[PDB]
Subunit: 157 residues, 6 copies
Amino acid sequence: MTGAVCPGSFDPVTLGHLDVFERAAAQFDEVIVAVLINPNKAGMFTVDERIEMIRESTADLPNLRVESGQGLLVDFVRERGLNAIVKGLRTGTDFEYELQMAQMNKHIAGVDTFFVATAPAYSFVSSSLAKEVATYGGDVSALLPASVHQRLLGKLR
Amino acid sequence: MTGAVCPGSFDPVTLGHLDVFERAAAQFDEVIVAVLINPNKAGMFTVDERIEMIRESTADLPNLRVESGQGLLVDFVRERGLNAIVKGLRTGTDFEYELQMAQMNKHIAGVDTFFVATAPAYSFVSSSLAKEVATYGGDVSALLPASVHQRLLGKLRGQA
Amino acid sequence: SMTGAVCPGSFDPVTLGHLDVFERAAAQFDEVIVAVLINPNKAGMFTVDERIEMIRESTADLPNLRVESGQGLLVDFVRERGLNAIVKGLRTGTDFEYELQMAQMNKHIAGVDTFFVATAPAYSFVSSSLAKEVATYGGDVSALLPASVHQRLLGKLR
Amino acid sequence: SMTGAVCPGSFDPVTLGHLDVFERAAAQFDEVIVAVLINPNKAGMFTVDERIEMIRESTADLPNLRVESGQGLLVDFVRERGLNAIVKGLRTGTDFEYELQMAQMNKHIAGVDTFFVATAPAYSFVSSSLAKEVATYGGDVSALLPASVHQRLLGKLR
Amino acid sequence: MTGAVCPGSFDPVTLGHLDVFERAAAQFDEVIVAVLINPNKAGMFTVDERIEMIRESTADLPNLRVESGQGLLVDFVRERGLNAIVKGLRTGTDFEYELQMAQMNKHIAGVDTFFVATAPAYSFVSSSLAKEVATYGGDVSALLPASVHQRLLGKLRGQA
Amino acid sequence: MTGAVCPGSFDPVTLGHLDVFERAAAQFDEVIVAVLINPNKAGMFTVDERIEMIRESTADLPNLRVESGQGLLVDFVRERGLNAIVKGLRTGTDFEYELQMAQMNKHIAGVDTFFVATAPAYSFVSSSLAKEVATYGGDVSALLPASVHQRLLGKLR
Ligand SMILES: CC(C)(COP(=O)(O)OP(=O)(O)OC[C@H]1O[C@@H](n2cnc3c(N)ncnc32)[C@H](O)[C@@H]1O)[C@@H](O)C(=O)NCCC(=O)NCCS
Ligand SMILES: CC(C)(COP(=O)(O)OP(=O)(O)OC[C@H]1O[C@@H](n2cnc3c(N)ncnc32)[C@H](O)[C@@H]1O)[C@@H](O)C(=O)NCCC(=O)NCCS
Ligand SMILES: CC(C)(COP(=O)(O)OP(=O)(O)OC[C@H]1O[C@@H](n2cnc3c(N)ncnc32)[C@H](O)[C@@H]1O)[C@@H](O)C(=O)NCCC(=O)NCCS
Ligand SMILES: CC(C)(COP(=O)(O)OP(=O)(O)OC[C@H]1O[C@@H](n2cnc3c(N)ncnc32)[C@H](O)[C@@H]1O)[C@@H](O)C(=O)NCCC(=O)NCCS
Ligand SMILES: CC(C)(COP(=O)(O)OP(=O)(O)OC[C@H]1O[C@@H](n2cnc3c(N)ncnc32)[C@H](O)[C@@H]1O)[C@@H](O)C(=O)NCCC(=O)NCCS
Ligand SMILES: CC(C)(COP(=O)(O)OP(=O)(O)OC[C@H]1O[C@@H](n2cnc3c(N)ncnc32)[C@H](O)[C@@H]1O)[C@@H](O)C(=O)NCCC(=O)NCCS
């Protein structure tokens, strides 16, 4: 049985993230989406809220489940008997950031990382920029799953 | 069950490539290394020579095999009943180049591409630069599989 | 008064990515001239007259655009027509560096300025070179090119 | 008819690099509006009114430019004024990626287009943040800022 | 005769930094490592702690010494009668960041900057990521000098 | 005695190259400019012509001399009892290219490389683009030393 973890902040999950999940789920026997706090935010949504938004958006991926993670990512991965991380890349900035972490994670624990390329339609999509646009009344409905849009309006209103 | 294709010129295969193969083979049930011609490159070794060197260098990888293809990469992949490509990345230029092909390949055939980061030790290794260094007598023995190194140096001494 | 810009390139052949740039230029400048020029570091497929023809077919619905060719410096092409602006599109970091260098050189030697626009997300991976390669090996690039160009591309290949 | 573009930014403070962009925008658009906006991910030094004042002092010789502020989405600022174009400057690959993302987002949510221009080579290393840092520790940034701004910068620091 | 300054936050010094120091010291008659505060970073160790760790880690470098500075880097450099800065580069982002400062520093004071490429083995090493990994119990012992590693882990266990 | 080699095609030398030479000569006791053929050109100028253009443009750098090089760069460097290469960087493209060669050269021979940043004024300057602009009558006189401009016109006319 093959398996991978898809870690992130997912604050909130976007259609770009979902595209990664779908492609990971198509190639691995099990996918665990791990919701972690990134060391330099506090977030708009609680971990539990993030988890629910992901679960509601991934119901059609039967081999995917969602979990909170704390502490070191490579510990999370190894504790669940896996040895693969799946991340996504939009930009050269993503590439540099992710390459550093991938090499570090492999060095400290032997855990490998696979990257998927963004869909062209979602290349400019990030949680941070979506939240900013929405905060000032901009329409980001085409960039997010339905399970996020209402929650996002609620948190802003 | 799960499977991936690792395509490339592999002209010749380096320890950088082999590292990618090993990591792909450790995650997927079967891996097929696909030796293809890059339309935009001059080559040194024939496809058959490239296949020989990879087969020679991948003996410890039981679930991997090596084949060639004459057309579109996505046709090679789908004809073997697979839908995943695995490619390695060293540099930002690799990233842009590979992102473009990944999106093109997904657009025309629905085939997905997964990237892996180079091993830090092999980040500066390419077939082109290894060939160039060896052409002028530099020591690339730590960058290539043993059999590749012998065949490369022999080839160069024949001056072809 | 009326403003104007030149959209130069190899356009070998013109793609939906190029066309997106032309449309956006024509929306913001009173006058746009698409300039077909030879890149001295490229081996071309179509002739200049073929390239011009394909662009003209594909830009019928842009009333303030015309298509021309030139055989020397881009900046001479621009100034000869009483203009001082170039518009280019960017997909990648590599495009950015390449275009930045030319933009600064062109400003230095002639005082002509250059404006860049970002690719449409849907056309980020589209290039003339790759569409030609994919088409050569039977791949379907119909969603990446004008039907006009798709036909002329498939025509010569097959 | 007349064309128009908005040149938005933090401008905290405006530098010779920004001014170069304004001049080039004003040369190619009939109307330019410099928009002082808050970046929600930045801690600002000068007030909006101070920023506006420094830009106005520095752009006296550009007759077709005015300076305004906004408190919401850039694309609302642009459309409210009957415009559909943004002009931004690029120094680095990091600028390119950042601006590309915003340009595609802004086009997506409002249909507003963005044009980029390359930095003047002499101002490639100039940023508001670094000029402020260098000035704070006594360094001479006089060749990087308008004398107006240099004075107001040195003023608050000393 | 010839000399260069190697400036940085060095919070804490890593084997990546030390590699730069060694290569600078092998080319210039004297090297001064300058521990400076980066105005745009939160720090973990005091400047004095940083100096101690570097001094501890550079014993095999006879022509190198370590000092601190409170103002402009270019003032630190020129006050010691030097005119060269040496910095290392791992990534394209390092390059853009360092190019900007190099041009600024040459503009305001005429001081030159020389860059060196990271050792491939340490390309992914940064103080920030090493601190983060150690904060969560990961093994960064191969990335840091022995004394640094002890002081870092001790510091973290005190949870400061 | 410290020393470095400044290798390149220099076809022709530009004011950007000269800026590198000047900064190298200010920090090293001796600088050797090495004119090599880059494996993928044939060049506009002969090696001897390139050498003369450099010598004429560097007369004011008394600790700099100019030489042709053949074969492996790190052999050239070590044969002259040096262990340092000095290159220049304009762009991210330069950085990637040069970083690869610097790591390769250090790996195969232990020779180190130091890079200098371009002067802002010359960042867009390359031999290739200068030659192209000149070929179509463009004025590149502000980008090249005087010892190059006449030779360049002569080679084009
Ligand atoms: C939580 C981690 C993974 C950081 O996550 P991050 O905040 O970056 O996640 P974020 O939600 O922003 O993004 C998640 C992933 O989705 C990708 N992505 C986002 N949008 C898109 C898109 N449109 N298309 C494709 N991919 C996308 C991102 O590039 C990223 O890879 C990291 O902080 C971590 O591992 N923390 C645990 C502690 C640890 O182990 N530290 C050591 C690291 S070496
Ligand atoms: C043959 C193809 C894949 C090009 O291969 P390419 O020449 O780039 O392969 P090359 O041998 O150079 O490299 C192979 C792969 O190994 C990676 N790699 C190289 N060195 C290393 C290293 N040290 N570490 C990790 N990865 C590495 C490369 O980044 C690349 O991903 C391409 O031309 C192709 O697909 N041709 C078929 C026609 C086709 O389908 N065309 C349409 C493409 S959209
Ligand atoms: C012909 C010139 C402009 C080069 O053109 P080039 O070959 O690069 O054109 P090409 O057709 O490939 O692309 C044209 C433009 O479209 C852009 N583009 C391509 N695809 C896309 C897309 N999908 N989306 C947006 N933009 C795109 C390109 O980035 C480029 O800006 C250049 O060679 C030139 O100016 N030649 C004349 C001689 C001269 O003046 N030389 C001195 C130059 S400083
Ligand atoms: C205010 C905005 C535009 C950000 O501006 P920013 O802080 O980046 O401005 P800053 O003053 O730093 O720079 C302004 C512009 O000048 C350019 N520039 C700076 N220096 C130079 C130079 N030397 N040469 C050329 N250009 C330069 C910058 O690259 C940038 O394009 C952005 O935060 C915004 O739009 N805010 C409004 C809210 C909104 O709409 N959010 C959604 C965005 S998708
Ligand atoms: C302190 C300065 C230099 C910033 O240092 P910084 O925080 O970036 O240092 P840091 O420790 O992070 O890194 C130091 C150097 O080591 C390099 N480096 C890091 N890791 C590695 C590695 N593995 N290999 C090679 N090099 C490396 C970095 O790229 C950097 O060049 C800067 O803030 C400064 O000059 N401050 C003084 C005030 C001043 O003069 N300001 C004006 C500057 S224009
Ligand atoms: C000859 C070499 C160095 C390549 O030289 P190249 O053709 O790149 O030189 P070129 O003349 O183009 O440039 C010379 C240097 O000047 C720099 N430069 C150019 N313009 C500028 C500028 N305006 N500002 C700063 N630096 C500049 C370049 O970035 C480059 O570093 C290389 O091919 C080589 O080493 N060949 C020998 C064989 C060998 O050893 N091969 C193995 C290499 S690992």
